[PDB]
Every structure is written in structure tokens, then in C-alpha cells.
Amino acid sequence: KYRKQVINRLARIEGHVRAIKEMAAEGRDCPDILLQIAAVRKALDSTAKVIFADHMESCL
Amino acid sequence: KYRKQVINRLARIEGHVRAIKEMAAEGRDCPDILLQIAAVRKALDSTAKVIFADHMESCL
């Protein structure tokens, strides 16, 4: 049903949030952290667009 | 350095993306999936705001 690339992107975004969590836990500098949050929001936005394109009929 | 609540939110958002990944892998309906993506984007946005408030001096 969903292309493997969709599932994989979601898996990557998962590891990315995990890392951001670990950045916070290690006391990394805030701008580093907020940079990565914004990158994840963008990746999620692209992923939703891809899914919407692939499954438009059922997404509407 | 970061409040435990920040770290924990990031941990929750992590499990949430994991679930979304599993929704995709199981062929869940697209609107369900896109609903959860949007919820994660919002959680991430709130988390960045919290961090920015707590560490404004070093985030600027």
C-alpha cells in the first residue's frame, strides 16, 4: 500500500528524533537542537506531501 | 541543562513517529496517517517554543 520509501523516511525521522532527544539529554547547545527540530518538521511535511500525492484519492 | 519534561516530550514524539511508521507499514488509511503527522509537527513546534523560552539567551 505505501511505498517502501515512505516507510523508510518515517524510520529515518524516527532515528532523527531519537538523536534530538539524546542531544537534549546531553546538554547540547540550544541552536543545534532547534535546528534539528526544524529539520524534522520539514522532513515530516515532505513525507505528508509524498503520501498525499501517492494516495490523493483516499487522502481527500 | 534541559528540563526533564523537554527530554520526555522528545521521547514521546519519538514513540509517536515509530507508531506512524508502523501505521504506514500496516497500510492504515491515509487520513489517519496524515492526521498523526500533523500532530507530531505541532508537538515538535511546541517543544521548540518551550526550549526557546527556557534557554532564550543561548537560543538567540
mmCIF file of all heavy atoms in Angstrom, chain A residues 1-2 7 10-11 14 17-18 20-21 24-25 27-31 33-34 37 40-41 44-45 48 51-52 58-59, chain B residues 1-2 7 10-11 14 17-18 20-21 24-25 27-31 33-34 37 40-41 44-45 48 51 58-59:
data_model
loop_
_atom_site.group_PDB
_atom_site.id
_atom_site.type_symbol
_atom_site.label_atom_id
_atom_site.label_comp_id
_atom_site.label_asym_id
_atom_site.label_seq_id
_atom_site.Cartn_x
_atom_site.Cartn_y
_atom_site.Cartn_z
ATOM 1 N N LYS A 1 0.840 -1.274 0.000
ATOM 2 C CA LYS A 1 0.000 0.000 0.000
ATOM 3 C C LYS A 1 0.838 1.270 0.000
ATOM 4 O O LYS A 1 0.645 2.078 -0.871
ATOM 5 C CB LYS A 1 -0.998 0.058 1.150
ATOM 6 C CG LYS A 1 -1.867 1.299 1.116
ATOM 7 C CD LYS A 1 -3.216 1.061 1.789
ATOM 8 C CE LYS A 1 -3.764 2.337 2.418
ATOM 9 N NZ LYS A 1 -4.220 3.438 1.513
ATOM 10 N N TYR A 2 1.755 1.463 0.949
ATOM 11 C CA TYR A 2 2.647 2.647 0.903
ATOM 12 C C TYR A 2 3.976 2.248 0.339
ATOM 13 O O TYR A 2 4.501 1.182 0.670
ATOM 14 C CB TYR A 2 2.808 3.322 2.294
ATOM 15 C CG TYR A 2 1.503 3.885 2.768
ATOM 16 C CD1 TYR A 2 0.727 3.208 3.678
ATOM 17 C CD2 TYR A 2 1.017 5.054 2.256
ATOM 18 C CE1 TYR A 2 -0.500 3.692 4.109
ATOM 19 C CE2 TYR A 2 -0.195 5.555 2.677
ATOM 20 C CZ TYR A 2 -0.958 4.846 3.599
ATOM 21 O OH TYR A 2 -2.170 5.308 3.969
ATOM 22 N N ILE A 7 7.873 4.389 4.159
ATOM 23 C CA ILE A 7 8.110 3.724 5.410
ATOM 24 C C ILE A 7 9.520 4.042 5.923
ATOM 25 O O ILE A 7 9.732 4.342 7.133
ATOM 26 C CB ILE A 7 7.816 2.196 5.289
ATOM 27 C CG1 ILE A 7 6.294 1.958 5.188
ATOM 28 C CG2 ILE A 7 8.268 1.444 6.540
ATOM 29 C CD1 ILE A 7 5.786 1.497 3.857
ATOM 30 N N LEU A 10 9.939 7.553 7.276
ATOM 31 C CA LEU A 10 9.382 7.590 8.592
ATOM 32 C C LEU A 10 10.326 6.957 9.585
ATOM 33 O O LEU A 10 10.475 7.468 10.701
ATOM 34 C CB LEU A 10 7.979 6.946 8.638
ATOM 35 C CG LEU A 10 6.864 7.819 8.045
ATOM 36 C CD1 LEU A 10 5.600 6.975 7.842
ATOM 37 C CD2 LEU A 10 6.540 9.102 8.834
ATOM 38 N N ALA A 11 10.986 5.862 9.190
ATOM 39 C CA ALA A 11 12.052 5.255 10.043
ATOM 40 C C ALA A 11 13.272 6.139 10.324
ATOM 41 O O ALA A 11 13.764 6.182 11.458
ATOM 42 C CB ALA A 11 12.499 3.916 9.523
ATOM 43 N N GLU A 14 12.203 8.885 12.610
ATOM 44 C CA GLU A 14 12.249 8.278 13.958
ATOM 45 C C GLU A 14 13.640 8.345 14.627
ATOM 46 O O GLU A 14 13.749 8.861 15.742
ATOM 47 C CB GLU A 14 11.709 6.854 13.906
ATOM 48 C CG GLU A 14 11.510 6.255 15.288
ATOM 49 C CD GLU A 14 11.364 4.767 15.294
ATOM 50 O OE1 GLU A 14 10.914 4.208 14.261
ATOM 51 O OE2 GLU A 14 11.641 4.201 16.375
ATOM 52 N N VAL A 17 14.625 11.984 15.538
ATOM 53 C CA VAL A 17 14.032 12.453 16.820
ATOM 54 C C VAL A 17 14.730 11.831 18.036
ATOM 55 O O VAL A 17 15.009 12.560 19.046
ATOM 56 C CB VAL A 17 12.474 12.273 16.921
ATOM 57 C CG1 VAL A 17 11.979 12.880 18.235
ATOM 58 C CG2 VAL A 17 11.717 12.956 15.799
ATOM 59 N N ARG A 18 15.066 10.526 17.911
ATOM 60 C CA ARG A 18 15.846 9.840 18.922
ATOM 61 C C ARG A 18 17.138 10.564 19.201
ATOM 62 O O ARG A 18 17.564 10.676 20.355
ATOM 63 C CB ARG A 18 16.154 8.411 18.509
ATOM 64 C CG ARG A 18 17.032 7.673 19.533
ATOM 65 C CD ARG A 18 16.963 6.128 19.476
ATOM 66 N NE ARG A 18 16.980 5.582 18.101
ATOM 67 C CZ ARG A 18 15.918 5.122 17.380
ATOM 68 N NH1 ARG A 18 14.640 5.090 17.864
ATOM 69 N NH2 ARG A 18 16.128 4.665 16.127
ATOM 70 N N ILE A 20 17.824 13.774 18.560
ATOM 71 C CA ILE A 20 17.465 15.069 19.134
ATOM 72 C C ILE A 20 17.177 14.938 20.615
ATOM 73 O O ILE A 20 17.624 15.755 21.415
ATOM 74 C CB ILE A 20 16.277 15.762 18.407
ATOM 75 C CG1 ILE A 20 16.581 16.028 16.904
ATOM 76 C CG2 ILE A 20 15.934 17.084 19.120
ATOM 77 C CD1 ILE A 20 15.414 16.582 16.124
ATOM 78 N N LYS A 21 16.435 13.897 20.957
ATOM 79 C CA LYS A 21 16.243 13.509 22.369
ATOM 80 C C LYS A 21 17.607 13.335 23.134
ATOM 81 O O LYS A 21 17.770 13.803 24.278
ATOM 82 C CB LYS A 21 15.404 12.227 22.415
ATOM 83 C CG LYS A 21 15.149 11.684 23.820
ATOM 84 C CD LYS A 21 14.608 10.290 23.783
ATOM 85 C CE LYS A 21 15.742 9.358 23.415
ATOM 86 N NZ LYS A 21 15.192 7.976 23.278
ATOM 87 N N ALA A 24 19.383 16.687 23.652
ATOM 88 C CA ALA A 24 18.818 17.338 24.822
ATOM 89 C C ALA A 24 19.331 16.695 26.095
ATOM 90 O O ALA A 24 19.812 17.359 26.986
ATOM 91 C CB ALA A 24 17.274 17.309 24.788
ATOM 92 N N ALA A 25 19.270 15.389 26.166
ATOM 93 C CA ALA A 25 19.767 14.669 27.340
ATOM 94 C C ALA A 25 21.235 14.934 27.651
ATOM 95 O O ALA A 25 21.568 14.975 28.793
ATOM 96 C CB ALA A 25 19.544 13.194 27.183
ATOM 97 N N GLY A 27 22.765 17.876 26.901
ATOM 98 C CA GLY A 27 23.002 19.287 27.141
ATOM 99 C C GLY A 27 23.676 19.995 25.989
ATOM 100 O O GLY A 27 24.355 20.989 26.158
ATOM 101 N N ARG A 28 23.367 19.555 24.783
ATOM 102 C CA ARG A 28 23.808 20.258 23.599
ATOM 103 C C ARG A 28 23.283 21.709 23.529
ATOM 104 O O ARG A 28 22.286 22.081 24.163
ATOM 105 C CB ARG A 28 23.374 19.463 22.388
ATOM 106 C CG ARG A 28 24.043 18.091 22.237
ATOM 107 C CD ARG A 28 25.542 18.145 21.825
ATOM 108 N NE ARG A 28 25.754 18.960 20.620
ATOM 109 C CZ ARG A 28 25.589 18.559 19.357
ATOM 110 N NH1 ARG A 28 25.295 17.308 19.025
ATOM 111 N NH2 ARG A 28 25.703 19.451 18.404
ATOM 112 N N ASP A 29 23.950 22.526 22.740
ATOM 113 C CA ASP A 29 23.576 23.928 22.608
ATOM 114 C C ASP A 29 22.240 24.018 21.948
ATOM 115 O O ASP A 29 21.950 23.281 21.021
ATOM 116 C CB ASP A 29 24.586 24.759 21.817
ATOM 117 C CG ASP A 29 25.970 24.823 22.504
ATOM 118 O OD1 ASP A 29 26.073 24.638 23.759
ATOM 119 O OD2 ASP A 29 26.947 25.064 21.765
ATOM 120 N N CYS A 30 21.431 24.940 22.460
ATOM 121 C CA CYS A 30 20.076 25.095 22.039
ATOM 122 C C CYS A 30 19.922 25.310 20.533
ATOM 123 O O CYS A 30 19.072 24.706 19.928
ATOM 124 C CB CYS A 30 19.429 26.219 22.791
ATOM 125 S SG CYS A 30 17.888 26.745 22.040
ATOM 126 N N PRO A 31 20.734 26.166 19.930
ATOM 127 C CA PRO A 31 20.526 26.354 18.466
ATOM 128 C C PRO A 31 20.729 25.075 17.619
ATOM 129 O O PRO A 31 20.026 24.882 16.623
ATOM 130 C CB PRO A 31 21.547 27.442 18.088
ATOM 131 C CG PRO A 31 22.048 28.017 19.387
ATOM 132 C CD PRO A 31 21.881 26.938 20.426
ATOM 133 N N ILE A 33 19.945 22.102 18.684
ATOM 134 C CA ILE A 33 18.727 21.367 18.943
ATOM 135 C C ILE A 33 17.584 21.914 18.110
ATOM 136 O O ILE A 33 16.887 21.138 17.424
ATOM 137 C CB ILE A 33 18.418 21.285 20.436
ATOM 138 C CG1 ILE A 33 19.513 20.440 21.150
ATOM 139 C CG2 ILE A 33 17.030 20.691 20.658
ATOM 140 C CD1 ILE A 33 19.291 20.205 22.638
ATOM 141 N N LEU A 34 17.444 23.234 18.089
ATOM 142 C CA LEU A 34 16.314 23.838 17.419
ATOM 143 C C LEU A 34 16.472 23.743 15.917
ATOM 144 O O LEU A 34 15.496 23.625 15.221
ATOM 145 C CB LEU A 34 16.196 25.315 17.804
ATOM 146 C CG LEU A 34 15.760 25.597 19.248
ATOM 147 C CD1 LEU A 34 15.561 27.099 19.345
ATOM 148 C CD2 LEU A 34 14.517 24.864 19.729
ATOM 149 N N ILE A 37 15.172 20.242 15.217
ATOM 150 C CA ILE A 37 13.734 20.164 15.279
ATOM 151 C C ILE A 37 13.101 20.689 14.000
ATOM 152 O O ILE A 37 12.095 20.148 13.490
ATOM 153 C CB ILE A 37 13.167 20.878 16.507
ATOM 154 C CG1 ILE A 37 13.559 20.099 17.789
ATOM 155 C CG2 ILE A 37 11.633 20.922 16.468
ATOM 156 C CD1 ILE A 37 13.190 20.748 19.118
ATOM 157 N N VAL A 40 13.421 18.161 11.233
ATOM 158 C CA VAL A 40 12.421 17.126 11.356
ATOM 159 C C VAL A 40 11.017 17.580 10.925
ATOM 160 O O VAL A 40 10.308 16.837 10.257
ATOM 161 C CB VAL A 40 12.391 16.555 12.800
ATOM 162 C CG1 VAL A 40 11.227 15.581 12.963
ATOM 163 C CG2 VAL A 40 13.692 15.830 13.140
ATOM 164 N N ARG A 41 10.588 18.788 11.325
ATOM 165 C CA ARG A 41 9.297 19.354 10.855
ATOM 166 C C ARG A 41 9.204 19.431 9.326
ATOM 167 O O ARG A 41 8.174 19.157 8.725
ATOM 168 C CB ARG A 41 9.001 20.691 11.538
ATOM 169 C CG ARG A 41 8.801 20.543 13.075
ATOM 170 C CD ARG A 41 8.276 21.830 13.757
ATOM 171 N NE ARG A 41 6.871 22.146 13.384
ATOM 172 C CZ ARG A 41 6.482 23.099 12.540
ATOM 173 N NH1 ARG A 41 7.342 23.856 11.954
ATOM 174 N NH2 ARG A 41 5.194 23.294 12.270
ATOM 175 N N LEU A 44 8.978 15.795 7.894
ATOM 176 C CA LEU A 44 7.603 15.325 8.105
ATOM 177 C C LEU A 44 6.604 15.961 7.097
ATOM 178 O O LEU A 44 5.741 15.300 6.541
ATOM 179 C CB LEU A 44 7.138 15.575 9.559
ATOM 180 C CG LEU A 44 7.640 14.598 10.656
ATOM 181 C CD1 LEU A 44 7.503 15.207 12.042
ATOM 182 C CD2 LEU A 44 6.957 13.219 10.671
ATOM 183 N N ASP A 45 6.722 17.244 6.902
ATOM 184 C CA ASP A 45 5.992 17.955 5.881
ATOM 185 C C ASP A 45 6.228 17.347 4.492
ATOM 186 O O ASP A 45 5.288 17.065 3.806
ATOM 187 C CB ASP A 45 6.351 19.427 5.922
ATOM 188 C CG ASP A 45 5.575 20.241 4.885
ATOM 189 O OD1 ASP A 45 4.379 20.384 5.012
ATOM 190 O OD2 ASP A 45 6.148 20.690 3.885
ATOM 191 N N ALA A 48 4.436 13.866 4.322
ATOM 192 C CA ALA A 48 2.993 14.022 4.147
ATOM 193 C C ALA A 48 2.558 14.368 2.687
ATOM 194 O O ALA A 48 1.576 13.814 2.142
ATOM 195 C CB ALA A 48 2.491 15.127 5.077
ATOM 196 N N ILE A 51 2.942 11.242 0.534
ATOM 197 C CA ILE A 51 1.851 10.334 0.788
ATOM 198 C C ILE A 51 0.582 10.872 0.155
ATOM 199 O O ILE A 51 -0.153 10.137 -0.482
ATOM 200 C CB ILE A 51 1.620 10.162 2.313
ATOM 201 C CG1 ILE A 51 2.809 9.392 2.978
ATOM 202 C CG2 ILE A 51 0.239 9.505 2.655
ATOM 203 C CD1 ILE A 51 2.752 9.473 4.513
ATOM 204 N N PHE A 52 0.311 12.143 0.378
ATOM 205 C CA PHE A 52 -0.814 12.787 -0.278
ATOM 206 C C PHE A 52 -0.786 12.656 -1.834
ATOM 207 O O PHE A 52 -1.799 12.339 -2.443
ATOM 208 C CB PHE A 52 -0.951 14.256 0.163
ATOM 209 C CG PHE A 52 -2.295 14.852 -0.161
ATOM 210 C CD1 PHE A 52 -3.361 14.698 0.673
ATOM 211 C CD2 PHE A 52 -2.494 15.542 -1.318
ATOM 212 C CE1 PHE A 52 -4.612 15.253 0.367
ATOM 213 C CE2 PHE A 52 -3.726 16.114 -1.623
ATOM 214 C CZ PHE A 52 -4.788 15.947 -0.791
ATOM 215 N N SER A 58 -7.778 8.671 -1.717
ATOM 216 C CA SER A 58 -8.106 8.243 -0.351
ATOM 217 C C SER A 58 -7.656 9.198 0.761
ATOM 218 O O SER A 58 -8.226 9.163 1.812
ATOM 219 C CB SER A 58 -7.556 6.837 -0.090
ATOM 220 O OG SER A 58 -6.169 6.893 -0.038
ATOM 221 N N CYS A 59 -6.705 10.078 0.498
ATOM 222 C CA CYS A 59 -6.361 11.145 1.403
ATOM 223 C C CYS A 59 -7.374 12.264 1.410
ATOM 224 O O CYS A 59 -7.504 12.927 2.434
ATOM 225 C CB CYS A 59 -4.982 11.768 1.074
ATOM 226 S SG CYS A 59 -3.604 10.621 1.001
ATOM 227 N N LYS B 1 20.696 20.677 32.445
ATOM 228 C CA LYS B 1 20.558 21.801 31.421
ATOM 229 C C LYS B 1 19.159 21.907 30.833
ATOM 230 O O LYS B 1 18.591 22.965 30.908
ATOM 231 C CB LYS B 1 21.572 21.704 30.287
ATOM 232 C CG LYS B 1 21.467 22.851 29.303
ATOM 233 C CD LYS B 1 22.801 23.126 28.614
ATOM 234 C CE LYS B 1 22.604 23.676 27.205
ATOM 235 N NZ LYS B 1 22.048 25.055 27.051
ATOM 236 N N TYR B 2 18.597 20.844 30.256
ATOM 237 C CA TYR B 2 17.196 20.906 29.771
ATOM 238 C C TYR B 2 16.291 20.267 30.778
ATOM 239 O O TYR B 2 16.626 19.224 31.347
ATOM 240 C CB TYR B 2 17.026 20.254 28.370
ATOM 241 C CG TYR B 2 17.791 21.015 27.330
ATOM 242 C CD1 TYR B 2 19.020 20.582 26.894
ATOM 243 C CD2 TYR B 2 17.317 22.198 26.838
ATOM 244 C CE1 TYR B 2 19.763 21.285 25.956
ATOM 245 C CE2 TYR B 2 18.036 22.907 25.901
ATOM 246 C CZ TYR B 2 19.278 22.442 25.480
ATOM 247 O OH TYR B 2 20.007 23.165 24.604
ATOM 248 N N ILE B 7 13.047 16.525 27.641
ATOM 249 C CA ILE B 7 13.594 15.268 27.211
ATOM 250 C C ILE B 7 12.472 14.244 26.998
ATOM 251 O O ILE B 7 12.444 13.494 25.981
ATOM 252 C CB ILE B 7 14.709 14.784 28.190
ATOM 253 C CG1 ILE B 7 15.973 15.654 28.022
ATOM 254 C CG2 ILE B 7 15.147 13.356 27.869
ATOM 255 C CD1 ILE B 7 16.291 16.581 29.154
ATOM 256 N N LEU B 10 10.381 14.830 23.897
ATOM 257 C CA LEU B 10 11.118 14.351 22.770
ATOM 258 C C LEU B 10 11.047 12.846 22.689
ATOM 259 O O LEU B 10 10.914 12.296 21.590
ATOM 260 C CB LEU B 10 12.577 14.859 22.781
ATOM 261 C CG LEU B 10 12.735 16.331 22.373
ATOM 262 C CD1 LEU B 10 14.146 16.816 22.729
ATOM 263 C CD2 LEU B 10 12.408 16.648 20.901
ATOM 264 N N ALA B 11 11.111 12.168 23.841
ATOM 265 C CA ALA B 11 10.895 10.690 23.878
ATOM 266 C C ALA B 11 9.514 10.201 23.428
ATOM 267 O O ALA B 11 9.410 9.206 22.701
ATOM 268 C CB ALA B 11 11.234 10.101 25.221
ATOM 269 N N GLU B 14 9.248 10.726 19.746
ATOM 270 C CA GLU B 14 9.929 9.553 19.158
ATOM 271 C C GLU B 14 9.014 8.320 18.987
ATOM 272 O O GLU B 14 8.907 7.797 17.875
ATOM 273 C CB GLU B 14 11.184 9.223 19.959
ATOM 274 C CG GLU B 14 12.053 8.180 19.278
ATOM 275 C CD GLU B 14 13.064 7.546 20.178
ATOM 276 O OE1 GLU B 14 13.475 8.202 21.169
ATOM 277 O OE2 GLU B 14 13.478 6.421 19.818
ATOM 278 N N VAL B 17 6.305 8.904 16.273
ATOM 279 C CA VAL B 17 6.799 8.678 14.887
ATOM 280 C C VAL B 17 6.964 7.186 14.573
ATOM 281 O O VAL B 17 6.573 6.730 13.447
ATOM 282 C CB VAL B 17 8.108 9.469 14.525
ATOM 283 C CG1 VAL B 17 8.453 9.230 13.054
ATOM 284 C CG2 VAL B 17 7.975 10.968 14.716
ATOM 285 N N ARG B 18 7.468 6.431 15.578
ATOM 286 C CA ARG B 18 7.557 4.989 15.476
ATOM 287 C C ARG B 18 6.217 4.379 15.148
ATOM 288 O O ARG B 18 6.127 3.446 14.344
ATOM 289 C CB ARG B 18 8.083 4.372 16.762
ATOM 290 C CG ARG B 18 8.132 2.837 16.708
ATOM 291 C CD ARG B 18 9.104 2.169 17.710
ATOM 292 N NE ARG B 18 9.067 2.765 19.063
ATOM 293 C CZ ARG B 18 9.958 3.642 19.606
ATOM 294 N NH1 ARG B 18 11.065 4.093 18.944
ATOM 295 N NH2 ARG B 18 9.753 4.087 20.865
ATOM 296 N N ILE B 20 3.593 5.920 13.761
ATOM 297 C CA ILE B 20 3.229 6.399 12.430
ATOM 298 C C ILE B 20 3.907 5.573 11.357
ATOM 299 O O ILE B 20 3.283 5.191 10.371
ATOM 300 C CB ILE B 20 3.516 7.914 12.214
ATOM 301 C CG1 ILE B 20 2.738 8.809 13.221
ATOM 302 C CG2 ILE B 20 3.159 8.308 10.769
ATOM 303 C CD1 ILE B 20 3.081 10.277 13.138
ATOM 304 N N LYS B 21 5.184 5.303 11.575
ATOM 305 C CA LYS B 21 5.928 4.338 10.740
ATOM 306 C C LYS B 21 5.203 2.945 10.645
ATOM 307 O O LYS B 21 5.093 2.347 9.555
ATOM 308 C CB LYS B 21 7.348 4.197 11.302
ATOM 309 C CG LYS B 21 8.231 3.199 10.554
ATOM 310 C CD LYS B 21 9.472 2.878 11.324
ATOM 311 C CE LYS B 21 9.087 1.974 12.475
ATOM 312 N NZ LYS B 21 10.302 1.726 13.308
ATOM 313 N N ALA B 24 1.972 3.161 8.603
ATOM 314 C CA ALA B 24 2.305 3.076 7.191
ATOM 315 C C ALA B 24 2.637 1.650 6.801
ATOM 316 O O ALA B 24 2.103 1.115 5.855
ATOM 317 C CB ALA B 24 3.477 4.018 6.836
ATOM 318 N N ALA B 25 3.492 1.011 7.561
ATOM 319 C CA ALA B 25 3.856 -0.380 7.289
ATOM 320 C C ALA B 25 2.670 -1.338 7.273
ATOM 321 O O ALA B 25 2.689 -2.243 6.500
ATOM 322 C CB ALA B 25 4.876 -0.859 8.279
ATOM 323 N N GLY B 27 -0.456 -0.368 6.353
ATOM 324 C CA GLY B 27 -1.426 0.018 5.346
ATOM 325 C C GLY B 27 -2.660 0.682 5.912
ATOM 326 O O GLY B 27 -3.728 0.644 5.335
ATOM 327 N N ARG B 28 -2.472 1.420 6.991
ATOM 328 C CA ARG B 28 -3.535 2.241 7.524
ATOM 329 C C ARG B 28 -4.036 3.305 6.521
ATOM 330 O O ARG B 28 -3.346 3.686 5.565
ATOM 331 C CB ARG B 28 -3.040 2.887 8.798
ATOM 332 C CG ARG B 28 -2.753 1.915 9.950
ATOM 333 C CD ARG B 28 -4.021 1.296 10.604
ATOM 334 N NE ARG B 28 -4.985 2.324 11.022
ATOM 335 C CZ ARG B 28 -4.944 3.030 12.155
ATOM 336 N NH1 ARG B 28 -4.052 2.813 13.113
ATOM 337 N NH2 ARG B 28 -5.816 3.994 12.315
ATOM 338 N N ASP B 29 -5.236 3.795 6.752
ATOM 339 C CA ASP B 29 -5.836 4.782 5.864
ATOM 340 C C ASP B 29 -5.055 6.052 5.944
ATOM 341 O O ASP B 29 -4.631 6.458 7.012
ATOM 342 C CB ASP B 29 -7.304 5.073 6.176
ATOM 343 C CG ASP B 29 -8.208 3.831 5.992
ATOM 344 O OD1 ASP B 29 -7.850 2.886 5.219
ATOM 345 O OD2 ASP B 29 -9.281 3.825 6.630
ATOM 346 N N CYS B 30 -4.871 6.662 4.778
ATOM 347 C CA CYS B 30 -4.053 7.823 4.637
ATOM 348 C C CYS B 30 -4.457 8.974 5.560
ATOM 349 O O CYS B 30 -3.607 9.579 6.164
ATOM 350 C CB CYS B 30 -4.052 8.282 3.209
ATOM 351 S SG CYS B 30 -3.403 9.943 3.026
ATOM 352 N N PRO B 31 -5.742 9.277 5.667
ATOM 353 C CA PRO B 31 -6.077 10.420 6.564
ATOM 354 C C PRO B 31 -5.675 10.217 8.043
ATOM 355 O O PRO B 31 -5.285 11.179 8.711
ATOM 356 C CB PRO B 31 -7.602 10.569 6.414
ATOM 357 C CG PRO B 31 -7.991 9.720 5.232
ATOM 358 C CD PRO B 31 -6.945 8.642 5.114
ATOM 359 N N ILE B 33 -3.010 8.581 8.946
ATOM 360 C CA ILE B 33 -1.581 8.799 8.908
ATOM 361 C C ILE B 33 -1.266 10.282 8.874
ATOM 362 O O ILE B 33 -0.450 10.763 9.686
ATOM 363 C CB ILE B 33 -0.913 8.001 7.790
ATOM 364 C CG1 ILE B 33 -1.043 6.479 8.087
ATOM 365 C CG2 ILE B 33 0.549 8.414 7.645
ATOM 366 C CD1 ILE B 33 -0.349 5.558 7.093
ATOM 367 N N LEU B 34 -1.965 11.017 8.018
ATOM 368 C CA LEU B 34 -1.652 12.417 7.833
ATOM 369 C C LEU B 34 -2.102 13.226 9.030
ATOM 370 O O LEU B 34 -1.475 14.200 9.360
ATOM 371 C CB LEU B 34 -2.358 12.957 6.586
ATOM 372 C CG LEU B 34 -1.827 12.444 5.241
ATOM 373 C CD1 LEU B 34 -2.561 13.228 4.168
ATOM 374 C CD2 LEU B 34 -0.323 12.537 5.033
ATOM 375 N N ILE B 37 0.815 12.765 11.420
ATOM 376 C CA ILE B 37 1.961 13.558 11.054
ATOM 377 C C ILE B 37 1.790 15.004 11.491
ATOM 378 O O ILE B 37 2.743 15.674 11.946
ATOM 379 C CB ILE B 37 2.273 13.469 9.558
ATOM 380 C CG1 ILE B 37 2.781 12.043 9.218
ATOM 381 C CG2 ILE B 37 3.392 14.443 9.164
ATOM 382 C CD1 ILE B 37 3.009 11.739 7.742
ATOM 383 N N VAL B 40 2.364 15.342 15.194
ATOM 384 C CA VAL B 40 3.774 15.368 15.501
ATOM 385 C C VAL B 40 4.446 16.710 15.165
ATOM 386 O O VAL B 40 5.258 17.203 15.940
ATOM 387 C CB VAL B 40 4.515 14.197 14.801
ATOM 388 C CG1 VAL B 40 6.024 14.327 14.998
ATOM 389 C CG2 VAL B 40 4.062 12.844 15.347
ATOM 390 N N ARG B 41 4.142 17.300 13.998
ATOM 391 C CA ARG B 41 4.651 18.652 13.649
ATOM 392 C C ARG B 41 4.279 19.713 14.692
ATOM 393 O O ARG B 41 5.065 20.584 15.038
ATOM 394 C CB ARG B 41 4.241 19.044 12.228
ATOM 395 C CG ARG B 41 4.878 18.121 11.148
ATOM 396 C CD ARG B 41 4.671 18.628 9.700
ATOM 397 N NE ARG B 41 5.442 19.866 9.409
ATOM 398 C CZ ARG B 41 4.940 21.096 9.322
ATOM 399 N NH1 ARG B 41 3.683 21.313 9.492
ATOM 400 N NH2 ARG B 41 5.723 22.141 9.063
ATOM 401 N N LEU B 44 6.279 19.000 17.980
ATOM 402 C CA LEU B 44 7.654 19.472 17.769
ATOM 403 C C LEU B 44 7.761 21.021 17.844
ATOM 404 O O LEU B 44 8.668 21.576 18.445
ATOM 405 C CB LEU B 44 8.228 18.953 16.429
ATOM 406 C CG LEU B 44 8.724 17.483 16.377
ATOM 407 C CD1 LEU B 44 8.817 16.983 14.944
ATOM 408 C CD2 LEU B 44 10.077 17.221 17.063
ATOM 409 N N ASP B 45 6.846 21.693 17.204
ATOM 410 C CA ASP B 45 6.701 23.124 17.311
ATOM 411 C C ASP B 45 6.533 23.567 18.770
ATOM 412 O O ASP B 45 7.234 24.434 19.206
ATOM 413 C CB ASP B 45 5.551 23.592 16.441
ATOM 414 C CG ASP B 45 5.375 25.111 16.483
ATOM 415 O OD1 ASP B 45 6.222 25.823 15.991
ATOM 416 O OD2 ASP B 45 4.414 25.615 17.076
ATOM 417 N N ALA B 48 9.945 23.077 20.636
ATOM 418 C CA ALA B 48 10.892 24.136 20.291
ATOM 419 C C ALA B 48 10.633 25.491 21.025
ATOM 420 O O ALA B 48 11.567 26.163 21.520
ATOM 421 C CB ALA B 48 10.841 24.385 18.784
ATOM 422 N N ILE B 51 11.679 25.112 24.675
ATOM 423 C CA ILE B 51 13.116 25.173 24.783
ATOM 424 C C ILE B 51 13.582 26.601 24.576
ATOM 425 O O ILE B 51 14.417 27.094 25.317
ATOM 426 C CB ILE B 51 13.788 24.264 23.719
ATOM 427 C CG1 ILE B 51 13.530 22.752 24.028
ATOM 428 C CG2 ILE B 51 15.314 24.566 23.529
ATOM 429 C CD1 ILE B 51 13.920 21.854 22.842
ATOM 430 N N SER B 58 20.727 31.781 25.177
ATOM 431 C CA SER B 58 21.586 30.907 24.366
ATOM 432 C C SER B 58 20.957 30.392 23.067
ATOM 433 O O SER B 58 21.679 30.055 22.174
ATOM 434 C CB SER B 58 22.090 29.731 25.207
ATOM 435 O OG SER B 58 21.025 28.886 25.492
ATOM 436 N N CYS B 59 19.640 30.409 22.947
ATOM 437 C CA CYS B 59 18.969 30.143 21.700
ATOM 438 C C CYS B 59 19.057 31.292 20.725
ATOM 439 O O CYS B 59 19.018 31.043 19.524
ATOM 440 C CB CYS B 59 17.469 29.818 21.901
ATOM 441 S SG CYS B 59 17.106 28.477 23.036
#
